[PDB]
Every structure is written in C-alpha cells, then in structure tokens.
Design a protein around this ligand. Structure first.
Ligand SMILES: *[C@@H]1O[C@H](CO)[C@@H](O[C@@H]2O[C@H](CO)[C@@H](O[C@@H]3O[C@H](CO[C@H]4O[C@H](CO)[C@@H](O)[C@H](O)[C@@H]4O)[C@@H](O)[C@H](O[C@H]4O[C@H](CO)[C@@H](O)[C@H](O)[C@@H]4O)[C@@H]3O)[C@H](O)[C@H]2NC(C)=O)[C@H](O)[C@H]1NC(C)=O
Ligand SMILES: CC(=O)N[C@H]1[C@H]([C@H](O)[C@H](O)COC(C)=O)O[C@@](O[C@H](CO)[C@@H](O)[C@@H]2O[C@@](O)(C(=O)O)C[C@H](O)[C@H]2NC(C)=O)(C(=O)O)C[C@@H]1O
Ligand SMILES: *[C@@H]1O[C@H](CO)[C@@H](O[C@@H]2O[C@H](CO)[C@@H](O)[C@H](O)[C@H]2NC(C)=O)[C@H](O)[C@H]1NC(C)=O
Ligand SMILES: *[C@@H]1O[C@H](CO)[C@@H](O)[C@H](O)[C@H]1NC(C)=O
Ligand SMILES: *[C@@H]1O[C@H](CO)[C@@H](O)[C@H](O)[C@H]1NC(C)=O
Ligand SMILES: *[C@@H]1O[C@H](CO)[C@@H](O)[C@H](O)[C@H]1NC(C)=O
Ligand SMILES: *[C@@H]1O[C@H](CO)[C@@H](O)[C@H](O)[C@H]1NC(C)=O
Ligand SMILES: *[C@@H]1O[C@H](CO)[C@@H](O)[C@H](O)[C@H]1NC(C)=O
Ligand SMILES: *[C@@H]1O[C@H](CO)[C@@H](O)[C@H](O)[C@H]1NC(C)=O
Length: 268
C-alpha cells in the first residue's frame, strides 16, 4: 500500500493487468540535461558535473489508467520505487477533447518516505494548464488515485483524507503550455534539500523551486488515473509517464549561438 488510511473499499481486486514498459535513454539531443544556475553559455562546449540520467539506461513507463477497478498490485514494487539521489521524468501530455475544446491530463506524482501524516509528502499534480505543487503532512490513502476532471470517471477522486487543512512547508502553482506534447522534469535531493527543474517546451529543463526538508526522501510513486475515456475502445489515446534514476555524472554539453543546449554526451 501507499500510506495507511482506509479511504474506500469500492471495486478493489488483485488482478495482474500489467507489465512495466521500457524504453532506452538517449541524451544526444539534450534530453536529460538542464540549464546551469543563472549562467548563459554561447556557441561552445562545456564539461559539467550534475544530476543526470545514465545514457543507455532504461526509462520505465509508470503511468496506470483505470476505469472502475483498482488492482492492489499497482500499489507495491515494482511500481512503488526507491528515490535515491533523484529521478528524471519524460511525461506525455494526454490532450483530450470535449465539444472541440482541448483539455490536458497526465499522471500525478508523489514523493516521500513513510507517507504517514507525521511526515512531509511532495505532490505534483496537473489541473488543465495549471501545475499544482505542494509539500504537506497528507493523510495518504491505502490505494490513492486521481480522475479525468474533463471526461469524468466511474469513481470519486481520493488520494488523501484530511478533513481539516494539513500542515504544509510549500504550496505553489506554475503554468504550463497545454498545447505541448511532452513535459520534462528533474526531481533530486542534496543535503536534505529537494530541487525541481522542468520544461514544457524543448528538452533541457530549468529550475522551478527548491525546498528544505531536513529528512531524506526515500520513495516515489505515480498515481493511477481513472477515466471513462483514454482507451482503444473510445479514442486510442494513452497516458505515458517515463522515469529513470538520476546520479552525479559528468556530461559534455553543447550550447548553440543563442544559448540553447542542442546536444550532450554522457562521458561514461
Ligand atoms: C493521521 O493518520 C492516522 C493514520 O496513519 C489517522 O489515524 C486513524 O484515524 C481513523 C479515523 O479516526 C481511525 O479509524 C477509526 O478507528 C476506530 C477504532 O478502531 C478499532 O475498533 C474497530 C471497531 O470499531 C476495529 O475494527 C479496529 O480493528 C480497531 O480495533 C473505529 O471504531 C472507527 O470505525 C468507525 O468509523 C468508520 C469511519 O469510516 C466507520 O466505517 C465504522 O463503521 C465505524 O463507525 C474507525 O475505523 C484509525 O483507527 C486511525 N489509525 C491509527 C493507526 O491511529 C489519524 O486520524 C490522522 N490524523 C489526522 C489529524 O487526520
Ligand atoms: C493499468 C492497466 O492495465 N490499464 C488498462 C485497463 C486495466 O487493465 C483494467 O481497467 C483493469 O481492470 C481490473 C483491475 O479489474 O484496461 C483498459 O482497457 C479496458 C479493457 O481491458 C477498457 O476497454 C474497458 O473495458 C471494459 O470492458 C471494462 O470494464 O474493463 C468496459 C470499460 O468501459 C472500458 N474502459 C474505458 C471505456 O475506458 C481500461 O481503460 O480500463 C485499458 C488500460 O490501459
Ligand atoms: C492553485 O491551483 C488550484 C487548482 O486550480 C486552485 O484550487 C482551486 O481553487 C478554487 C478557488 O479557491 C476552488 O474553488 C477549487 O475547489 C480549488 N481546487 C480545484 C481542484 O479546482 C488553487 O486555488 C490555486 N492557488 C493556490 C495558492 O493553490
Ligand atoms: C475499510 O473500510 C470499510 C468501511 O468501514 C470496511 O468495510 C472494510 O472492511 C475496511 N477494510 C480494511 C482493510 O480496513
Ligand atoms: C504479471 O504478469 C507479468 C507478465 O506476464 C509477469 O511478468 C509477472 O510476473 C506477473 N506478476 C504477478 C504478480 O503475477
Ligand atoms: C560558432 O563557432 C564556430 C567554431 O569556432 C565558428 O566557426 C562560427 O563562426 C561561430 N559562430 C558564431 C555566430 O559565433
Ligand atoms: C461519490 O460521491 C457521491 C456524493 O457523495 C456519492 O453519492 C457516491 O456514492 C460516491 N461514489 C463512490 C464510488 O465513492
Ligand atoms: C505552446 O505550444 C505549441 C506547440 O509546441 C507552440 O506552437 C506554441 O507557440 C506554444 N505557445 C506558447 C505561448 O508557449
Ligand atoms: C483504434 O485504432 C485501431 C487501429 O487503427 C482501430 O482498429 C480501432 O477501431 C481504433 N479505435 C478507435 C476508438 O478509434
């Protein structure tokens, strides 16, 4: 389980519906890199040491789409994952339509340790072009999940159950371009401080925020999303949430004559 609060018992079973899909990391076009601090470099190559993917390691697609039932197996290893230094995410923006109006959906991610309400859990969740980010003492459910707020779902939303507002270290919103096909994120920790970088356009990410926690983060998990759409019998749309572990590595980076990172090489 995630957390330990019994939020609901509606439509739960133990069915093995899944295999973790895999894809190979290739940083040759700047995927997995980030812009360095407040610096700018022009028409040049730099050797830089940072939190980067291993080139030629795998991405895992951790996204899960449900309709009514939730499998208990979705809330265990290999999905519940060790955080270590951090993770890089490549996220498909699942652009849906209702009455020819566009809506953006993708999987919420949570990062934490015990997920009990005596500890801080980070949550990153989209709301159709608003990205909501929080770090609070949430009472996480045993079986957390989200919903398609656009197309609807056969079940109500529940990933935490706090009746009063929980204590929070952080709460902010960031906009993202709902028209783009891919969002990239780095999440990592150093000396008890969490760091987040993202991009919605291009591949190299840029700094969103950092947050002192003091405690080591140990686990992350990508929430199942429940929807009456997003399947081969209604629209052939799909969720994807690819992740791969970060580590301290040396990269060659190439910056063009307008300061964009166009290419990179992992030096091992
Ligand atoms: C921070 O997070 C913790 C969990 O990590 C929360 O603690 C849990 O809080 C809930 C809600 O108060 C507790 O659930 C209630 O426990 C009562 C006692 O359980 C014993 O008795 C029942 C029989 O009544 C046995 O089956 C059980 O094995 C235990 O021996 C129950 O009496 C309550 O049941 C009643 O309410 C539910 C509500 O849905 C009804 O469905 C039932 O029919 C019944 O009317 C209820 O189950 C839970 O025990 C707490 N867990 C722990 C480990 O402490 C904190 O509440 C949370 N803090 C904040 C501020 O939110
Ligand atoms: C994580 C995962 O495996 N995700 C897949 C999902 C699950 O395996 C399934 O939910 C598990 O179920 C458990 C745990 O019991 O199956 C999906 O495909 C279904 C068929 O497998 C889909 O076509 C549904 O078929 C129905 O016959 C039915 O009820 O399953 C009628 C329903 O209206 C229709 N859903 C719609 C309209 O989206 C789905 O979506 O749910 C595609 C998802 O990628
Ligand atoms: C951040 O974005 C969220 C999601 O849009 C905002 O939350 C909504 O706020 C309105 C007005 O208070 C409520 O009616 C809704 O119920 C809220 N939830 C949702 C899911 O829409 C939030 O107000 C924004 N700002 C901050 C500081 O969090
Ligand atoms: C969860 O809560 C419901 C309602 O109280 C109860 O029927 C069910 O047996 C509970 N399950 C567990 C594992 O506590
Ligand atoms: C689920 O099915 C996959 C693919 O067949 C298999 O690799 C895996 O061991 C199964 N897991 C469980 C829990 O049965
Ligand atoms: C970029 O660098 C190359 C190699 O030194 C040079 O040939 C080219 O003229 C430079 N262009 C600009 C606009 O700096
Ligand atoms: C969803 O919420 C509504 C309103 O409280 C309730 O009538 C319905 O039974 C709930 N369904 C589930 C599966 O939680
Ligand atoms: C949003 O994304 C689309 C597709 O990449 C792009 O054409 C458009 O110019 C972007 N708009 C803004 C305001 O970023
Ligand atoms: C999904 O794509 C397949 C292959 O083209 C097709 O057979 C199927 O009818 C499509 N379903 C929908 C809802 O478009």
């Amino acid at each position: 389980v995630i957390g330990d609060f019994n939020c609901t018992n509606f439509a739960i079973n133990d069915l093995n519906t899944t295999v973790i899909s895999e894809y190979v990391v290739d940083v040759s076009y700047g995927l997995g890199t980030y812009y360095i601090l407040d610096r700018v470099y022009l028409n040049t190559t730099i050797l830089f040491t940072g939190y980067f993917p291993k080139s030629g390691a795998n991405f895992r697609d951790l996204s899960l789409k449900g309709t009514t039932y939730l499998s208990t197996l979705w809330y265990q290893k290999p999905f519940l994952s060790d955080f270590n230094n951090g993770i890089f995410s490549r996220v498909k923006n699942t652009k849906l339509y209702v009455n020819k109006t566009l809506y953006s959906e993708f999987s919420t991610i949570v990062i934490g340790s015990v997920f009990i309400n005596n500890s801080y859990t980070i949550v990153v969740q989209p709301h159709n072009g608003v990205l909501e980010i929080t770090a609070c003492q949430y009472t996480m459910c045993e079986y957390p999940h989200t919903i398609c707020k656009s197309k609807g779902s056969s079940r109500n939303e529940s990933w935490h159950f706090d009746k009063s507002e929980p204590l929070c270290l952080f709460k902010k919103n960031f906009t993202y371009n709902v028209s783009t096909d891919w969002l990239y994120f780095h999440f990592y920790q150093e000396r008890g401080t969490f760091y987040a970088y993202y991009a919605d356009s291009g591949m190299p990410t840029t700094f969103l925020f950092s947050l002192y926690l003091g405690t080591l983060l140990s686990h992350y998990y990508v929430l199942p999303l429940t929807c009456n759409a997003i399947s081969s019998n209604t629209d052939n749309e799909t969720l994807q949430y690819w992740v791969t572990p970060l580590s301290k590595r040396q990269y060659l980076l190439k910056f063009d004559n307008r300061g964009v990172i166009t290419n990179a090489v992992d030096c091992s």
